[PDB]
Amino acid sequence: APKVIVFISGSCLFGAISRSLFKKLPIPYTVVLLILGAILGVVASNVPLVEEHTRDVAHMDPHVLLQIFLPVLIFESAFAMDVHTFMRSFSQVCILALFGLVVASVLTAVLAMNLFNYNWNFSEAMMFGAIMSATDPVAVVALLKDLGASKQLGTIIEGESLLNDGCAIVIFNVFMKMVFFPQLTSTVGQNVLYFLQVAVAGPLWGYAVAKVTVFFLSHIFNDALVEITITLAATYLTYYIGDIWLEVSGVLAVVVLGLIVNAEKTSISPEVEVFLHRFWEMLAYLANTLIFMMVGVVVTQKALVAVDKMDWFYLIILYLAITIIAGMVISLFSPILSRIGYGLTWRNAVIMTWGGLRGAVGLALALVVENLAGNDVIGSKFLFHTAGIVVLTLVINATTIQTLLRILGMSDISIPKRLAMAGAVRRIHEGQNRTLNMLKSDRFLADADWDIATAACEISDPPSPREFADMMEEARLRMLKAEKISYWKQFEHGMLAREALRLLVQHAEVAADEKDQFILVDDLKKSWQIKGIYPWLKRKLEDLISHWNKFDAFILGLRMLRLTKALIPKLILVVNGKINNQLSLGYDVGKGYIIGEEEVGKIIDRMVDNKKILRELKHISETGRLQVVKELGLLQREHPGIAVSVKTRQAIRTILNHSRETIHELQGAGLLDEMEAHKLELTVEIKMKRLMNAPSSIPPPPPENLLKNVSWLAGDMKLIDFIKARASLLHFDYGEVIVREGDESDGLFLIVSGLVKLYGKVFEDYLTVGNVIGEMGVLTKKPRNATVTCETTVQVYFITAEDMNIAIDTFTLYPSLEYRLWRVVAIRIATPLIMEQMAFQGWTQEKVKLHLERGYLVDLAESHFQFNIDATLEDVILINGTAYNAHTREEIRSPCLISRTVHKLTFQYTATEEPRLFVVRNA
Amino acid sequence: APKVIVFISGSCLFGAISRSLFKKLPIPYTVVLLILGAILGVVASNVPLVEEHTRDVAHMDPHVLLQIFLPVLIFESAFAMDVHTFMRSFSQVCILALFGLVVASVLTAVLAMNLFNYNWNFSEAMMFGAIMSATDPVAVVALLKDLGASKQLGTIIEGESLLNDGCAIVIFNVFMKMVFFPQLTSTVGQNVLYFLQVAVAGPLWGYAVAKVTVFFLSHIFNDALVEITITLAATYLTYYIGDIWLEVSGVLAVVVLGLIVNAEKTSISPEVEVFLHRFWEMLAYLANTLIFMMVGVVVTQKALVAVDKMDWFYLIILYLAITIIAGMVISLFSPILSRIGYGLTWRNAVIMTWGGLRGAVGLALALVVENLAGNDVIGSKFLFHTAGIVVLTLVINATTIQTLLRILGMSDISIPKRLAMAGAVRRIHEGQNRTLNMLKSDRFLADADWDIATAACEISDPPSPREFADMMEEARLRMLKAEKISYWKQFEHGMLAREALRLLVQHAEVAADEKDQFILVDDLKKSWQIKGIYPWLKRKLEDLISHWNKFDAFILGLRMLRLTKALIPKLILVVNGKINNQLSLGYDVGKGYIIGEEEVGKIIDRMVDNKKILRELKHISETGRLQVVKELGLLQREHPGIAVSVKTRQAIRTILNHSRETIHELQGAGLLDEMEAHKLELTVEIKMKRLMNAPSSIPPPPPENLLKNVSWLAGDMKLIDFIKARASLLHFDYGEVIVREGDESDGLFLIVSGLVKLYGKVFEDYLTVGNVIGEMGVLTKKPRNATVTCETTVQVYFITAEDMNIAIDTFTLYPSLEYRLWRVVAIRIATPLIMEQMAFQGWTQEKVKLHLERGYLVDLAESHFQFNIDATLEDVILINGTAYNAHTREEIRSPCLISRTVHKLTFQYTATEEPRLFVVRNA
């Protein structure tokens, strides 16, 4: 009876011990395992009891390694990697990785045939090439996440290594079938059919099963066990069908499946995602430790009894030559990918070519070859050379990559990061000091040994023009830091998607590394300019495509061609989603950029000593913002329905995020137990996942609905009825100027279609559908100050000023028309004042807008032209009028944000400014 | 070749479909599976292809069910429940479940022998009894948590059912060995040895392996894969060693192991805990669906071809009889557990006896019996009756338990809960309305179809003396709700342990649903009165136990008795930990209760209109708080070292929780990226887990250290040196009075040892080590006002008032001695004023103390006896003096919290009150 429990349990214990011991040491733990296996070799040669307990797991069948270990390893490697970052450059890195692996494998095969003294043929040479070209992503990604080198470098290395592993496995399987089973003979047609199968019908099958199971899981809500078991059963079924047909080359199918399940994040809850990630990580860890222990035992038992010194000499030459080949291949290839539009610097190139670490896949293939060889020396030579390369790489490169990284400055100590950690540590120290000072005066905790508590406070973490150039450089660095801070603050507020945030911080770090450059709008255009591609032409053909009835009558197994009609709309819907999946992210960059830009403007205007530097910075940032908003408006005009759908999606996402924030604030205040908060969050999540299944296209609403749903017209049917009675429709062509600066208040505008340009005073802006022009002119009777030019053909709704005055006089309820108009113009004119004065850390646009929404416009008629100040109200803003303080005789004119030390003030009535002001009282 | 993939994958898919369909319907989904299995029976009898694909999984070996399915099911049921709640009721539930199960099994066996027409001996009858006495916890607890019946009832049912399953498995194994393998013959000695093995050496082995692996895992930090694989390997090794020796009765061992790994929460990360819970849940779900499908297929194929109508009649009689037996057993037992000190009401009794749901364990045992029987009719009768009872129970009881629950009012709609959900929903609606009003005025999102956004707002959730009795009843309910709110607020602030919070809410609900009583101090005493038990006597013997050296010299395999000396201290340390594990929770109740009281005394007095009700409520709450603090002080006096250790632990826990709060606040503000926050939280968690490994006992510091570490003496060596020079030591016995009311300000007193009572004018308190008495008298020169009586023997440090006046005159630095004293007395006198005035939702003692710590005592010399008010400062508190406002001539006397509308005011200098006041300026 075979005996396996002792070996498996001892290997698990040895993996645990060696993994915990070598956490601080620079070499990986796995080599220790190999070393331990070597010891278990020698003892097993002498004591027959250890041989009896080891030989049943050490000398396994090759089919266990080819069917159980390798698919698990490759699927975990393809599952852990973030697919979305791989997708932005998937085709380019695909061609790079495949051609590089083939070139390297052929070069190593020719070297093995020529340099070695053994008599090896060509089909036993590409086996050696494909064995020693299967790198490992996990070790290098762990190393790069340890010192924090770079996200892009890590994910590029991970993707290239995964592709290398896949095609190396395919090549090895083909040539193993050629060598060890010579009776299997095929012609050129059979070979091209097999290649077509492997490279087409495998990944297609995996994609099909992945999409079918995602469609299944989309019907299941609030059920984790079902999602877990369905995903695991689907993974096994994909592997089983792809492995009875394509043999080992079927692993590609499950690889593709992993990527699909790694991409979709709506139909699968995050708990299921983390459980599946941990499950496959544990399985791959088991397989890896087992493979290393077996390779150590076998290489000590039988592979080191037929080795000469010439073998060691060949091994060291081989180690030099594989790195030389990798470096030459990368250096030769890099001009081509630079030409094609892929960024590959030379420092990234040298790090990547020195970062090839051989892993357990090469050892598994070598073990399979050794098991199939039998008593021939080819198996021993294969295993010895593969283990030698693995140990040499794990000893040398895994330690010298830190030296190369520190020398080249891939991850240099960023003064931004230094200031951030210093500020966080200082705040932590102040908070701990305050907490300790509070606790030492408590009534109960008055006798504890405070030396230990004080020891718990230990927190530690590791005018020349050239001077003006240095000043503008550091101002640029501070601007980029403020931009990154704004991006992070927006993301934590539930305003930006993860992909949008990643793109923004990528552009930020590149502009930090650029030669005194900033975020370029031309570079930013790639976020939303992928709208005009083959999906658009396909949608046009599909909604352009009578003859159908004639064809169906002619048909009456071609009857299933009727299903073509049933497939006509669905594809259209599908392609709509693709356009949606390109438009939303675009907005999630564009609008987001806008918001961030405004904040950083104020920041530089409060920190640059030289006025010229801040002036030029403000100019370039403002023209970038203007270009972004113009392009956004043009995109809105180009494609109406998808824009409406994405705006509805954004509004619902913001509403649900703020409701969740209310839930958390209530739960932390003790008014809600865990059960009620859990249930209400469950309802919110159900509504969010329903929103994720909303239609990707929505018909554009008619202009009557836009007139009805004005932010101040809503509330009563009389208001909208009278406005509809007295509204005019106006059409304007290209290049027309509607009103000019200095013209009187003819009335109130409403952009219901098109894009318009509003310029005057040096300030300009672009307005789109839903915007309203000229409320101040119709309210305060002052002439207009901004000329509007029609950027394109524009339809507007014009309401005359006399009709608005009549409507104001007609309705005098508590939510008065004039009151609502003045409140709206008050918040719109008071937001920048609070932005300029209260520019502290932690106040975003959404929070300040909600805070102003809590406030109200306060009448001064009851106060008899003299406002009573208070310490209860957070802020008071002078919107209209002129305030006079008898104390010190202080005269302030609107608009202004008066200081908190300002006491009671009086007003004087005039025919040009009736006193109106805004207050935000506390709760 | 056996064919298994189709059956397993189809069963998984059918489980998914039936689980999704029956999420709303009342009956459980599993019966559907059984029904589907029935269909798969009939087809398999006709089509030979379905028979070929089914017969290799439907008719399995009994050893698969006895070795793979049952250990997984029992381990999962043992691993799911909370072990601490089971251990709290261990003494009664264990004996109740075991003896009641034996009584029920014997009764069912006798009924099977007598009522049925089959000729069965006693051993097969007891096998039948043990098969049909194995209930199921998961369905019952899922039903009880669905309608929210009760947590305690659910966990009691869960524990009792787990013990039922274990004992039923043991009895079944013994009688199966008696019946189906008659050659295995044993005497009385072999039987008692086997019973001793099963009931002693199994659980002991599981306990030993669990403790060893917990000790192993305690050396591993920030490593999830190692913890997961070590725990899984340990579980398998425990099962394997306990199954080659005890056969199926070895499952008890792994059961115990589960409980241990379910108890420890320090050495195992929460991520590992949730992964292990999900892993075992998925495995048990697989085993359950497989068992139900196989039992359906087998019961339709062969078990329903040898059934008469008398079998159905016997089945319905048996279904009546099992419920009758369970009810009679529970009703007969309940007086005994009520006498022994266990709460078992009749409503809980009837719900528990109607809530016994048969599960998959009975079906697995029936399948094993059917497989072992062969062609005899006993297997068919067993399987038919077991499946009939399972389906009858799952159809009837799983639906009528809701009817009984609603009729008896186990979970009635609590008006407290109704008010809480109504307030939360109202706040949610107001917040969503505010967010929508903000969004509809945005510059970009102005064209989205707002009908969908408005539809997203749809969120909803389902003077007579007798009148004075009703009023005091509702006031009591309001007081208990305020107490529960305070408990939840304290727990979310990182101040209470989960067990302490559970204990407090248990007392809160018991005092709510029982009479007009409140939370009783006598009932609360059980939290910290388990200190005086056999651990204390054992510690005394172990530290009273030369002679050992003489015995070792006499010995020089008794040499290993020298290890007894090495075993001497460790056990002592162990027992110290046990005492710590009893003291900490006591404080986590006691202090917590005090804080809860310090909330309600600031709430109900503002709510109750009648002075009598609030007066009596305040009286009873005050005397309860006084009893609690007196008992706490006596406990501190009883055991010094453990009290010092737990107080140090509490201080460090609070410091680390507040540092984590600061980290989260910084991360949400955008100043910290995800990586920096992750690393700093990792360091905080490392320090927290180091604190969890701190010594359980600490030597008491000398009084010199207590004098040195005064909250205001620290800062300079000269101050502490002079104080140590001029400090006197005083000793007082029982019943002595140190000072009396009206006596002159002799000086400051420091309590360094003992408990003292301070009473005076109607208010009284108890003071302990570290408290300071008489700062106001030594500062303002006012004579004393509260007498102090020595509750026990007390050592104090006495400092004369003249010496402190000399010290005040000697040191005049920026942190002056008088300044520090006045600040300390100012915050101590100003906390209750803010508690009374600002009694809003969300202000706790810690937050208000930190807010006052941010503030400072403001000098009035620079203001020339006229303070300037501002709107920047949050609050201003009058400490000493009399404020005069020339406007409206307002005179305010110390102490008072002036209103926020109070403007600038002047002061008049007097020899009795130098003007001093506290302010808390904003950031």
PDB file of C-alpha atoms in Angstrom, chain A residues 706 709-711 750-754 767-773, chain B residues 440 442-447:
ATOM      1  CA  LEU A 706     -36.318  69.981 -20.073  1.00  0.00           C
ATOM      2  CA  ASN A 709     -37.669  69.889 -15.061  1.00  0.00           C
ATOM      3  CA  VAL A 710     -35.922  73.175 -14.295  1.00  0.00           C
ATOM      4  CA  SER A 711     -34.235  73.211 -10.874  1.00  0.00           C
ATOM      5  CA  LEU A 750     -32.283  78.117 -21.680  1.00  0.00           C
ATOM      6  CA  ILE A 751     -29.988  75.892 -23.748  1.00  0.00           C
ATOM      7  CA  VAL A 752     -32.094  72.858 -24.705  1.00  0.00           C
ATOM      8  CA  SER A 753     -29.903  71.665 -27.601  1.00  0.00           C
ATOM      9  CA  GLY A 754     -26.371  72.376 -28.800  1.00  0.00           C
ATOM     10  CA  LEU A 767     -22.402  75.771 -21.939  1.00  0.00           C
ATOM     11  CA  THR A 768     -24.485  72.773 -22.986  1.00  0.00           C
ATOM     12  CA  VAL A 769     -28.012  71.365 -22.752  1.00  0.00           C
ATOM     13  CA  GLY A 770     -29.766  72.053 -19.453  1.00  0.00           C
ATOM     14  CA  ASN A 771     -27.771  75.180 -18.611  1.00  0.00           C
ATOM     15  CA  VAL A 772     -29.418  78.540 -17.935  1.00  0.00           C
ATOM     16  CA  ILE A 773     -27.940  81.881 -19.022  1.00  0.00           C
TER      17      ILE A 773
ATOM     18  CA  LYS B 440     -30.350  68.877 -10.200  1.00  0.00           C
ATOM     19  CA  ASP B 442     -25.187  70.824 -11.317  1.00  0.00           C
ATOM     20  CA  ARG B 443     -23.492  72.149 -14.440  1.00  0.00           C
ATOM     21  CA  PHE B 444     -22.927  68.766 -16.122  1.00  0.00           C
ATOM     22  CA  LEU B 445     -25.689  66.399 -14.935  1.00  0.00           C
ATOM     23  CA  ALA B 446     -28.492  68.601 -16.244  1.00  0.00           C
ATOM     24  CA  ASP B 447     -29.998  66.437 -19.013  1.00  0.00           C
TER      25      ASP B 447
END
